[PDB]
Design a protein around this ligand. Structure first.
Ligand SMILES: N=C(N)c1ccc(CNC(=O)[C@@H]2CCCN2C(=O)CCc2ccccc2)cc1
Ligand code: NA
Ligand code: NA
Lengths: 250, 28, 11
């Protein structure tokens, strides 16, 4: 995250780290949506143009973390992947359309002060919250600009009008994506960056004061560039696929 | 779970984090 | 790398 700030302890207890086994390194962000299911970006796992195609046993899930590099003894939990599920219509060839994936854990993780799942929105929450100008929150252990942080970073960002999103890029934008970030005129800035991939965009509903994951960090051209915006996978738009997977392979 | 989205160290204890008020103010 | 070692058990 660019131009964000240090997270508070327990501020994003749904925050998950995708960690490669060898060499040991941060892979992506991700989020806890139940004791056994983690949500992330498909591009974190599969991206043939960069010869990226991770299998279950190449990966670990690190939950409850604050520190980027430390092994947080008695706080974090580290879990084994049982099975990865990528959207069958994830478009890695063109624009990262349907950039979403699920990961089933080998055994359930124990909830704690630092470990707790986020909600997925229903149509009315999405309809009420995903409005231009409303702000969401994004978090991650990614780069601080186009160094790496010592701890989890956080930044609040406004959702941007779809035509403004469209007019910011040559890439073909879809209804499964939304963009967020400040316009050059709105003096403040901030953005997700490489390494934040797969992490959640969350909003706190003023109706029940629960946090909902509305988006997943997907793509952007550069990080925190004026007149460019970060693009997010539209979680509510892919929710039927999410339920199906969870319902079927439990 | 039924408890999704309620953080043990904030909502469960009725504490607010330092910038959640920025979100609410935008929910016009 | 700059990452502290995780318990062998997870690997
Ligand atoms: N500024 C941001 N918010 C931001 C920037 C980068 C990322 C990480 N995502 C990535 O790097 C993704 C992987 C495929 C190419 N890529 C890109 O973002 C490059 C632009 C692009 C978009 C869609 C298809 C092809 C190219 C995530 C967020
Ligand atoms: Na355009
Ligand atoms: Na920008």
């Amino acid at each position: 995250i660019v131009e964000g700030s240090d997270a508070e302890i327990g501020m994003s207890p749904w925050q998950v780290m995708l960690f490669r086994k060898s060499p040991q390194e941060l892979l992506c962000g991700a989020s806890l949506i139940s004791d056994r299911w983690v949500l992330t970006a498909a591009h974190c796992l599969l991206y043939p143009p960069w010869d990226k195609n991770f299998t279950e046993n190449d990966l670990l899930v690190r939950i409850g973390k604050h520190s980027r590099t430390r092994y947080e003894r008695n706080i974090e939990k580290i879990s084994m992947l049982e099975k990865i599920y990528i959207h069958p219509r994830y478009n890695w060839r063109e624009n990262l359309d349907r950039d979403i994936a699920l990961m089933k854990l080998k055994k359930p993780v124990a909830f704690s002060d630092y470990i707790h799942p986020v909600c997925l929105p229903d149509r009315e929450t999405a309809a009420s919250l995903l409005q231009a100008g409303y702000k969401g929150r994004v978090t991650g252990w990614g780069n601080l600009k186009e160094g790496q942080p010592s701890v989890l970073q956080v930044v609040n960002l406004p959702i941007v009008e779809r035509p403004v999103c469209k007019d910011s890029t040559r890439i073909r934008i879809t209804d499964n994506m939304f963009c967020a970030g400040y316009k050059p005129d709105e003096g403040k800035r901030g953005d997700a960056c490489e390494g934040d991939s797969g992490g959640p965009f969350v909003m706190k509903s003023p109706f029940n004061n629960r946090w909902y994951q509305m988006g997943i960090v997907s793509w952007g051209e550069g990080c925190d560039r004026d007149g460019k915006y970060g693009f997010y996978t539209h979680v509510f738009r892919l929710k039927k696929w999410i339920q199906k997977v969870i319902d079927q392979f439990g | 779970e039924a408890d999704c989205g309620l953080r043990p160290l904030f909502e469960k204890k009725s504490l607010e984090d330092k910038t959640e008020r920025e979100l609410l103010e935008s929910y016009i | 790398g700059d990452f502290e070692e995780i318990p062998e058990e997870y690997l």
